[PDB]
Design an enzyme around this catalytic site. Structure first.
Site, PDB file in Angstrom:
ATOM      1  N   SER A  10     -41.713  55.857  26.940  1.00 26.09           N
ATOM      2  CA  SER A  10     -40.727  56.117  27.997  1.00 26.09           C
ATOM      3  C   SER A  10     -39.504  55.194  27.934  1.00 26.09           C
ATOM      4  O   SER A  10     -38.540  55.392  28.680  1.00 26.09           O
ATOM      5  CB  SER A  10     -41.379  55.998  29.380  1.00 26.09           C
ATOM      6  OG  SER A  10     -42.402  56.965  29.562  1.00 26.09           O
ATOM      7  N   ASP A 150     -33.088  47.063   9.212  1.00 30.24           N
ATOM      8  CA  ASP A 150     -32.316  46.130   8.383  1.00 30.24           C
ATOM      9  C   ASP A 150     -31.857  46.803   7.088  1.00 30.24           C
ATOM     10  O   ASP A 150     -30.709  46.644   6.672  1.00 30.24           O
ATOM     11  CB  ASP A 150     -33.132  44.871   8.061  1.00 30.24           C
ATOM     12  CG  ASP A 150     -33.480  44.065   9.302  1.00 30.24           C
ATOM     13  OD1 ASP A 150     -32.684  44.088  10.267  1.00 30.24           O
ATOM     14  OD2 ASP A 150     -34.548  43.410   9.311  1.00 30.24           O
ATOM     15  N   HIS A 177     -37.605  39.730  10.163  1.00 31.59           N
ATOM     16  CA  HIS A 177     -36.639  40.417  11.024  1.00 31.59           C
ATOM     17  C   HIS A 177     -36.123  39.503  12.140  1.00 31.59           C
ATOM     18  O   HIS A 177     -36.456  39.673  13.326  1.00 31.59           O
ATOM     19  CB  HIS A 177     -37.244  41.708  11.589  1.00 31.59           C
ATOM     20  CG  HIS A 177     -36.304  42.478  12.462  1.00 31.59           C
ATOM     21  ND1 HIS A 177     -34.997  42.730  12.104  1.00 31.59           N
ATOM     22  CD2 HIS A 177     -36.476  43.043  13.679  1.00 31.59           C
ATOM     23  CE1 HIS A 177     -34.404  43.418  13.063  1.00 31.59           C
ATOM     24  NE2 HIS A 177     -35.280  43.619  14.032  1.00 31.59           N
ATOM     25  N   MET A 228     -32.640  52.467  16.096  1.00 29.93           N
ATOM     26  CA  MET A 228     -34.002  51.960  15.932  1.00 29.93           C
ATOM     27  C   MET A 228     -35.005  53.110  15.902  1.00 29.93           C
ATOM     28  O   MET A 228     -35.988  53.065  15.148  1.00 29.93           O
ATOM     29  CB  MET A 228     -34.365  50.969  17.042  1.00 29.93           C
ATOM     30  CG  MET A 228     -35.739  50.337  16.876  1.00 29.93           C
ATOM     31  SD  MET A 228     -35.848  49.325  15.387  1.00 29.93           S
ATOM     32  CE  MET A 228     -37.328  49.978  14.626  1.00 29.93           C
TER      33      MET A 228
END
Lengths: 314, 314, 314, 314
Positions: A10, A150, A177, A228
């Site tokens: 969500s 990345d 990361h 993302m």
């Protein structure tokens, strides 16, 4: 016919990521988990004209049902950065979230591939591994820290500077990361690109601070969500393709490693039916890149130890 | 080389819509507009490894720059419904949103395809047409009320009942996009399907109330967003494909029509380089379906009149 | 020591309303209801150093427990206007919100004072009365349409124009709570004030459109919340004081009325132990004010009928 | 007659805080600042029938005008906690927010009482003091870290356990505003209360974790807002009463201190016309409380140096 669970479905990353997974022909069951709004999100997505059967689960007691029989679990769950923050500022929240969710995985789908997006990845992957160890179901070949964004950023930025199509560019990115632990190997880029050192340094820095740029541009409205979701989708599609038998599937990912003095490290990985088929390692690098690896090691080891100690003190 | 503008790009529909558009190799320039958050959404999307140049625009002053040289404009902007609302309840607010944005379209990209998602479509498309007429740039072949989500829903529900892959189901849906004005032509469905009349009436009611079902399931947190982005993206892709000379591209869409006594009406449309190549019309239908068409015309005409009258007072 | 329930306690009106009630020594027990966020809101408020015991209730299953033994129920629940919207655009949502919540009051606290803030008040009060009639527990002396914000506004605007302290200004406002049904009896203002007719007309129109002014100023972020919380708190306090035996407590409120041919109407009301102790009526008014009463009656009857019709269709 | 500024007036704390201040006869001028929504909040509040003139300010250009002539500035601005975070986790965002806003205060109202709500208070007060030193206008008797909510909580919880009126309870709370730095001096409570050890220990912990319990209860939707607004208002009122010459006004607050080796520390403060009239110090405490003071000091010193080091790197 893969069953994929999305933990944190969500949220800002969760919703578009679920959309991309729903749209894929590789997915046949898509179970969605969160602590709010999940039934509305599943209802929304269940109207889309693809085969994946969607189900929304809500609250801790429904987490086992969401996880049972899963082949892949993606974990975009987590609090996002606001301007000024490091990813480590979110350690306390996201570490407890990752430990709780991965504990549920270890119990209810110990065999599934665990793809962790929740940051800081440099710590949350160690956390995931240790939690699986405590349940005695530890498999280093199935636990992935999703660093794919990345790579995606590196490809885009190299393409922009050289006037190429980003789809035709491939830049291995190794290390971890966060900040200077993100090491783009421009020397191994396909096609081969020649940058003078001042441009190389500017390009490398851009890649390393790219997340902070988005946080700044969003001016308080969170961190990267849509890109993302794209990167998260890409990695899960690579992994599922490999699980279906596709050959030559290579993705960089932050995993339990044997490549450096770090017990965890991101390198190119050949993927297959049991997850990591082979760690392809760092390979040949320039002096610039070798120096970045050396400088990244202390921070990585510190982040790993922090993740490990958080679990070991539960 | 499609230059696509998204007006309302920061909203619940706008963001995942912009993502899907960014992911497509059909798009070379993606310009995003809203009154808030657009630079952050644009920064986010600009990292994805596709060729589309992403640019965020913010506030009325930057609206002309967003529209400059656009081939397509999609308008997901608009207040969404809460439980117990009709789409017509949002008319007053969304009508002034659409009239402002379409006015800017008529001034700065009069030749572009205009794709209106903003509801109520049954009234907002007429508003668009009238606004374009007031600027003397009205082309009825280029104005589209996006009803695609009704088709997507119909395809999924038919597929679920018959145990088929919904990706190879095609149900024409005609009329408009509101309650009983949504008329699914199950008789024209491919592959051919047969339901008992009681099941047909249930299927048809479900399709008509599908938007409300998601609103209810979201329990106050808006209406369909992710499926609406999928449906909007599919329509834009269809349209852009046809503009590149792809053949056989058919979509239902609420457009200027001479198929019934309604001045605007949705039917399957053959798309081409000019926009609407040919309105393929209602075609042969069942008595049940003809009854629904007859029942819908009063509401449609009232919704059309309402939209036309709104533009009268500006 | 009233037990007061707030239905819609998590909304923009409800949270600061609940805060003001929690701060009052007139309240010994405060129950908070909503479909989301109530536990957090109650936890927050329960830390405040006043005697009122606070408890949060979440979802219909906990609604009866919230209402048990309540002396007063305040209903701020409801969708707020955005720019361009009329209050009637929200009729459908708020009519079904009010119908659901007052039906629960009729069943679980039928003897409680019912204070409806949910708009449009001109219809939602008729709805409340009919719902209570259906359950056979209708007491017209205990059902109040909260129009107090209109009086509060009129006092402020009069005080500002005359350079008075608003706390010493009282302006009776009669009629209803929408546009031109809002009738400020400036001739009955204390202290007595004189305005030229053009100023009086401007002052009168300012009061009538004051809610729209705030909706405009918030530019999409909703309608009056904080001033409405103040007005709701003031009405509840006046009512509770009167229930405790305080004498001479007069508040204007939209109630069952025989002061005009309108079956519901707002006038100054003497409050007391049984709720409405006495309807003080319209009283002596100017010709200008008389004209407004006459002009308002048509809209009021339409709004009343519209509300009654809605209850019949359940 | 007091002029009060609220910086961050549109947020969860800011709005109800602004309401409470507007409701008070102590306030003649209320100026509101934020980067968004202030005009709507101000328009809303300006309708309330109290004497305080309300003005909304928006953007860096208007911040100076918001602050000029202010007697008191309250700063609720800042990002709130989510479940699992420490207040320190928000340092890197809220540090630069406090830095910017307090610099504006040092420029435009250096003689005003500066009341910082923005957390982590243990670090942001040091920031505020250093910013004022840079501007050459540092007065330690006018800078207050608002810890009043800890006292309010302590009063409530003590009253609940003993069955007292919380209005009659006053518990001194010393140290700082984070976990174990929050030290309730139950031995110094008025009225004097005796608790068995197991209740004393559970009471003390409840007070220390009270912030987290509200964050947990809100399940991701922020931290205390309504009770923080109450506590901030109370503190402002205490300050204003003292400025108006009222005697015996005592409030605990986190200020420049010489009570321990910590350069900043919270103790009861006699307030006067020029702010801190007299630091009343820790006084006589129990062994259990002395231990808590000892345990708190290392964390306070680290939180203090962190704030100082932040300003030194600008």
């Amino acid at each position: 016919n893969a069953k994929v669970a999305v933990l944190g479905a969500s949220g800002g990353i969760g919703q578009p990521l679920s959309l991309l997974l729903k749209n894929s022909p590789l997915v046949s069951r898509l179970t969605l988990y969160d602590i709010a709004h999940t039934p509305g999100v599943a209802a929304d997505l269940s109207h889309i004209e693809t085969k994946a059967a969607v189900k929304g689960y809500l609250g801790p007691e429904q987490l086992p049902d969401c996880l049972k029989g899963c082949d892949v679990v993606v974990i975009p769950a987590g609090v996002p950065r606001k301007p000024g923050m490091t990813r480590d500022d979110l350690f306390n929240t996201n570490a407890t979230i990752v430990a709780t969710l991965t504990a549920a995985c270890a119990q209810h789908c110990p065999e599934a591939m665990i793809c962790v997006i929740a940051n800081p990845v440099n710590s949350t992957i160690p956390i995931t591994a240790e939690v699986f160890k405590k349940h005695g179901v530890y498999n280093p070949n199935k636990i992935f820290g999703v660093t794919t964004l990345d790579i995606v950023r590196a490809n885009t930025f190299v393409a922009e500077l050289k006037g190429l199509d980003p789809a035709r560019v491939n830049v291995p990115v190794i290390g971890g990361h966060a900040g200077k632990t993100i090491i783009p190997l421009i020397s191994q880029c396909t096609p081969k690109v020649d940058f003078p050192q001042d441009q190389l340094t500017a390009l490398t820095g851009r890649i390393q601070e790219a997340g902070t740029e988005v946080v700044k541009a969003k001016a308080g409205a969170g961190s990267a969500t849509l890109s993302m979701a794209y990167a998260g989708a890409r990695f899960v599609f690579s992994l599922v393709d490999a699980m279906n038998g596709k050959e030559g599937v290579v993705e960089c990912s932050f995993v339990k490693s044997q490549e450096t003095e770090c017990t965890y490290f991101s390198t190119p990985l050949l993927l297959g039916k049991k997850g990591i088929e082979k760690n392809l390692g760092i390979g040949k690098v320039s002096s610039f890149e070798e120096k970045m690896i050396s400088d990244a090691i202390p921070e990585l080891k510190a982040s790993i130890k922090k993740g490990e100690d958080f679990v070991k003190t539960l």
